[PDB]
RNA sequence: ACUCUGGUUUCUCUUCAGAUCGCAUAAAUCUUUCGCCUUUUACUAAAGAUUUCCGUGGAGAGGAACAACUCUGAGUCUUAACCCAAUUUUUUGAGGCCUUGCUUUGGCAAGGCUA
RNA sequence: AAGGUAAGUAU
């Protein structure tokens, strides 16, 4: 019993709609939306620590996002080989 | 050269963490010393004691993937051509006889005789 | 970031 990954277009659509809270269609359930918003600093911390390095053009990262698009987390720790990382930054 | 030994990867969970949990390094709270002082919320910078957070290790448990592929260790780790013996055993000249002591007798003990 | 709200009655 493991959660299968969703297509990247699913979260794209979820973010694209429900953008403004003024819509009254999804206002019925907001405790699930509001309760997951306190972890915004966690999303900030995970996002900035996975910032791409100057030698990298595009960095695809695993993403853990709320079912309503309330918050998105970068579920990845930037592990780097120390000699490789130091040599890359020296270059 | 024989036989048995039986993994690695990955995702969770539960606990234990001495150790540079971390060859890196944040914040909060409290109690003392200050610095600003005029009241909160911020602070100044040292010490002491906590808590949280970003991470970490070991062990245990439960799933998945490559489950079929081999390891290591142990087990006795198992074979013939031609060439060899003065220090321990298949080439090794080490034989016998007698004396006297002594043992209930057998024998034993020492010496002598060699070839 | 505050210690910088007049208290109102009408529409």
UniProtKB/Swiss-Prot annotation:
Widely expressed. It is found in: Nucleus; Nucleus speckle. Part of the U5 snRNP complex. Component of the U4/U6-U5 tri-snRNP complex composed of the U4, U6 and U5 snRNAs and at least PRPF3, PRPF4, PRPF6, PRPF8, PRPF31, SNRNP200, TXNL4A, SNRNP40, DDX23, CD2BP2, PPIH, SNU13, EFTUD2, SART1 and USP39. Component of the U5.U4atac/U6atac snRNP complexes in U12-dependent spliceosomes. Within the minor spliceosome, which acts on U12-type introns, interacts with PPIL2 and RBM48. Core component of U2-type precatalytic, catalytic and postcatalytic spliceosomal complexes. Found in a mRNA splicing-dependent exon junction complex (EJC) with SRRM1. It is linked to Retinitis pigmentosa 13: A retinal dystrophy belonging to the group of pigmentary retinopathies. Retinitis pigmentosa is characterized by retinal pigment deposits visible on fundus examination and primary loss of rod photoreceptor cells followed by secondary loss of cone photoreceptors. Patients typically have night vision blindness and loss of midperipheral visual field. As their condition progresses, they lose their far peripheral visual field and eventually central vision as well. The MPN (JAB/Mov34) domain mediates interaction with TSSC4 and SNRNP200. Has structural similarity with deubiquitinating enzymes, but lacks the residues that would bind the catalytic metal ion. Plays a role in pre-mRNA splicing as core component of precatalytic, catalytic and postcatalytic spliceosomal complexes, both of the predominant U2-type spliceosome and the minor U12-type spliceosome. Functions as a scaffold that mediates the ordered assembly of spliceosomal proteins and snRNAs. Required for the assembly of the U4/U6-U5 tri-snRNP complex, a building block of the spliceosome. Functions as a scaffold that positions spliceosomal U2, U5 and U6 snRNAs at splice sites on pre-mRNA substrates, so that splicing can occur. Interacts with both the 5' and the 3' splice site. This is Pre-mRNA-processing-splicing factor 8. The gene is PRPF8.
